Design a protein around this ligand. Structure first.
Ligand SMILES: [Cl-]
Ligand SMILES: [Cl-]
Ligand SMILES: [Cl-]
Ligand SMILES: [Cl-]
Ligand SMILES: [Mg+2]
Ligand SMILES: [Mg+2]
Ligand SMILES: [Mg+2]
Ligand SMILES: [Mg+2]
Ligand SMILES: [Mg+2]
Ligand SMILES: [Mg+2]
Ligand SMILES: [Mg+2]
Ligand SMILES: [Mg+2]
Ligand SMILES: [Mg+2]
Ligand SMILES: [Mg+2]
Ligand SMILES: [Mg+2]
Lengths: 132, 122, 122, 122
RNA sequence: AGACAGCAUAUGCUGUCU
RNA sequence: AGACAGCAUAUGCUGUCU
């Protein structure tokens, strides 16, 4: 039982994002998208455990999960310089409703560490970036 | 004045029923009573109403500035499951963070019969 | 590119509608275009975005550093009364100082039917 | 110009309401008035604005440099308690230092009904 | 839906201290 | 550069009333 008590495996990107979702208010907000985006980059970087630990450390300072994710996007080394992923959509009406008003023209050189979550591209080759 | 008598006075100033603010008023009233600052708490609450702000603003202000409350951890409240949490409180439940305090808006920690927990956040 | 088309492009980078930054975009687009410096203004804007600053920061920076704006008096715009100013701008209205300029964050001077003036500040 | 009218004039240049700068504007207007220097005070304020400085910077500068304010003790303002202090000033209350003076950025000393003091600092 | 209220985040501008 | 503060905008969450 002691092995079972103390064993803490690294989480998959999907399990990581699900844990984050439990601390966030609402559903399909820009923070939910960021949680999925960051979880994927953290995982592929081999930093799933470090990222989750850093997330909890910020929370333990009294900050909520929204403040934690934006701080991590700013400071966590696996995110520095990283470009937001491009996501194909039929059109921009397809972007989750609570995200739509956070859409902006793509700047020339968008990065996660400046608050750019993802870039949506439509079937017409148009693009918008999701900004927190 | 008792913890329960205090809480009902506050209820007369709050819109609706069993909202997060109702729970907060109950949680604060108990802590205030136990610290012996039950009188001082109510006066502070009235003082703020006089200044033109409402009850919600009074409770959040007091929860952040009232001596008795600063640093205090939200209490654990047993429920059968999270759908027996009062309905106007259910969409304000989150995972419990490591160090919740009432002065940041954490009202209480609900624990289920499975030993799972959620925190009520204003 | 016309002043009008310049402002429409800048609007694609801006959050909200009719904010003080929308007004500033329109005011700077007109001044830039009249200076014959429309191409240079748009290039300097993009160059700033490309350094990682957002569009709001780029417009205030251009207002402070783009030669064609230094010491320029904000344009006077006639309005029925200050309730007619766009809602998101009304809280940013101040008494007109002596010697307002664009480079110090003064966007425009609203002039009411009754002859009073307020200046919009970013 | 009376202390009240002077403060009213200054208020038209300030953002928000009941900020520490509104309290300073009232404090300085009274001191200038009492010393027969309201005219010179208003002129010095306008002069600084006409250099492109904003109203907040003008008031902090005048508090430091205008002769009528040098070494003046901030006025003591009696209040029920510190919840009575305007909300935008509350986070700017500090312990009263040794020898508070207007020219070192201390605006006023609030004295609670229970004999405690805190000073408002810009 | 809207109005109001409370909470949070991001950005800009300003001021003070180190 | 950081800490803190003030003001504004934008967005999101929750509650009530209609
Ligand atoms: Cl219980
Ligand atoms: Cl005063
Ligand atoms: Cl007199
Ligand atoms: Cl007197
Ligand atoms: Mg299609
Ligand atoms: Mg009620
Ligand atoms: Mg919008
Ligand atoms: Mg008006
Ligand atoms: Mg004002
Ligand atoms: Mg929260
Ligand atoms: Mg500074
Ligand atoms: Mg210093
Ligand atoms: Mg020093
Ligand atoms: Mg809402
Ligand atoms: Mg709601």
């Amino acid at each position: 039982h002691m092995e079972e008590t103390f064993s803490k495996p690294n989480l998959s990107a999907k399990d990581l994002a699900l844990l984050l979702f439990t601390h966030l208010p609402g559903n399909n907000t820009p923070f939910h998208i960021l949680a999925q985006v960051l979880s994927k980059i953290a995982y592929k970087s081999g930093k799933s455990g470090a990222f989750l630990d850093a997330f909890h450390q910020i929370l333990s300072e009294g900050e909520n999960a929204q403040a934690a994710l934006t701080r991590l996007s700013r400071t966590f080394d696996a995110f520095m310089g990283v470009v937001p992923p491009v996501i194909r959509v039929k059109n921009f009406q397809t972007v989750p409703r609570p995200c739509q008003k956070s859409l902006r023209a793509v700047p020339p050189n968008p990065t996660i560490d400046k608050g750019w979550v993802c870039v949506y591209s439509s079937e017409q080759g148009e693009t918008r970036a999701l900004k927190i």
